[PDB]
Each structure stands twice: as C-alpha cells, then as structure tokens.
From a paper:
Comparative analysis of the structures indicates that, while the overall structures of WT KRAS4a, KRAS4a-R151G, and WT KRAS4b are very similar to each other, the loop leading to residue 151 and helix α5 in KRAS4a-R151G is nearly identical to WT KRAS4b and less similar to WT KRAS4a. This further highlights the amino acid at position 151 as the key difference between the two KRAS isoforms. Overall, the structure of KRAS4a-R151G is more similar to WT KRAS4b than to WT KRAS4a, in both the crystal and solution states, despite the fact that WT KRAS4a and the R151G mutant differ only at that single position, whereas KRAS4a-R151G and WT KRAS4b still differ at five other positions in helix α5. The absence of a long positively charged side chain in KRAS4a-R151G results in the exposure of a contiguous patch of negative (red) electrostatic potential. This surface closely resembles that of WT KRAS4b, which has a native glycine at position 151.
These isoforms differ in exon 4, which encodes the final 15 residues of the G-domain and hypervariable regions (HVRs), vital for trafficking and membrane localization.
Author numbering: 1 to 168
The structure:
C-alpha cells in the first residue's frame, strides 16, 4: 500500500490547520487552537493510484514531541505555507525552507510553496512575487483557499507527484 508522509509548515495564522482539515474532512474549520499539532491519515486516490496520506500539521511549539521529530526525519515532502494577505508570513518562508534543508542535509527535498487565503481580496503578496520565489527554489507554487477548497488537492497532490519524481 503506497504511502506518502507529508509535513505542513509555515508561520502561525497562515491556514496550515484549515488546509489540512479541508483536505482530510472536506470542510472549513475557522477556529482551531494555534498551538495544537496533530497528524492526520487518509486513504485517497491520486492520479488513479490508491494511496495513504500521513500528514503532520505543525504548530511551532517549544515542547518536545517524539512524533514531530519522527515526521521531520522521515517526512518525504513539505508544504511551505504563507497567506497572500500577510506579507510577514511570506517573508518567513525562507527560514522554514532552510530548516527543512538542514533536517534532510539536502538542497533537493520535495516541497511546494503554498499561498493560502486566495479567496480574500486584500492581496499584498502578488502572484509574480511568489512565482519568482518558487522559481528561485526550483519548486512549484500553488494558490489555495482552505475556505473554498480552491487549489487544496492540487497543493497536496502536487507534493505527492514531487515525491514520486524524487523516488525515481
Ligand atoms: N479567508 C480565509 N481564512 C482562512 C483560510 N485558511 C485559514 N483561514 C483563517 O485563518 C486563521 C488561521 O487559520 P489556521 O488554520 O488556524 O492557521 P495555522 O495557525 O497556520 O494552523 C483562522 O482564522 C482561519 O479561519 C483561507 O483559505 N481563507
Ligand atoms: Mg494550526
């Protein structure tokens, strides 16, 4: 049974928990404690392949978690999330990518840049800025809305496709 272990990272408030809950449970949760870190597993079909997703929704807290360490060590791909109406969260992306590179001791880790909250009209990070950053890292950029589901499967499934390419 094919399995893909994914990790969702990025600044507090960008929609990591809402994106993960949307993917797994097909609804938008508008309040979810920003300190809760949990994993979610689901059987899905991606490009006709039945597979298991095993996703860590990180929360950036200081307390030790053996599970968190395990997902960093064995996680196969990472979503790096910012919000398109939060310039600071976009400025914070580079730090998350640098951490992931250190965990893997590698420049080539399957990764997707995710610009969430694209349903909102107050866009302060434009598509070109994000596309240029993604191009600099050599990774895809996907715009998402956890509220409407726009791009949500694309973001996670694109990550799965990046993993598939890496495995070859
Ligand atoms: N409009 C909008 N609000 C969102 C979206 N995703 C998350 N939110 C809201 O943004 C806030 C932070 O979301 P949350 O999932 O807790 O973010 P996390 O701290 O990254 O886990 C909450 O108020 C969510 O309701 C989205 O796509 N659109
Ligand atoms: Mg959260």
């Amino acid at each position: 049974m094919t399995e893909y272990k994914l990790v969702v990272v990025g600044a507090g408030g960008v929609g990591k928990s809402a994106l993960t809950i949307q993917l797994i449970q097909n609804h938008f949760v508008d309040e979810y404690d920003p300190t809760i870190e949990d994993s979610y597993r689901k059987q899905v079909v991606i490009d006709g392949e039945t597979c298991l997703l095993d996703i860590l929704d990180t929360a950036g807290q200081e307390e030790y978690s053996a599970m968190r360490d395990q997902y960093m060590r064995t996680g196969e791909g990472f979503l790096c999330v910012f919000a398109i109406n939060n310039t600071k969260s976009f400025e914070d992306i580079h730090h998350y990518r640098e951490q992931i590179k250190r965990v893997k001791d590698s420049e080539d880790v399957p990764m997707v840049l995710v610009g969430n909250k694209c349903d909102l009209p107050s866009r302060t990070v434009d598509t070109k800025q994000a596309q240029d950053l993604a191009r600099s890292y050599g990774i895809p950029f996907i715009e998402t809305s956890a509220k409407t589901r726009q791009g949500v499967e694309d973001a996670f499934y694109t990550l799965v496709r990046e993993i598939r390419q890496y495995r070859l």
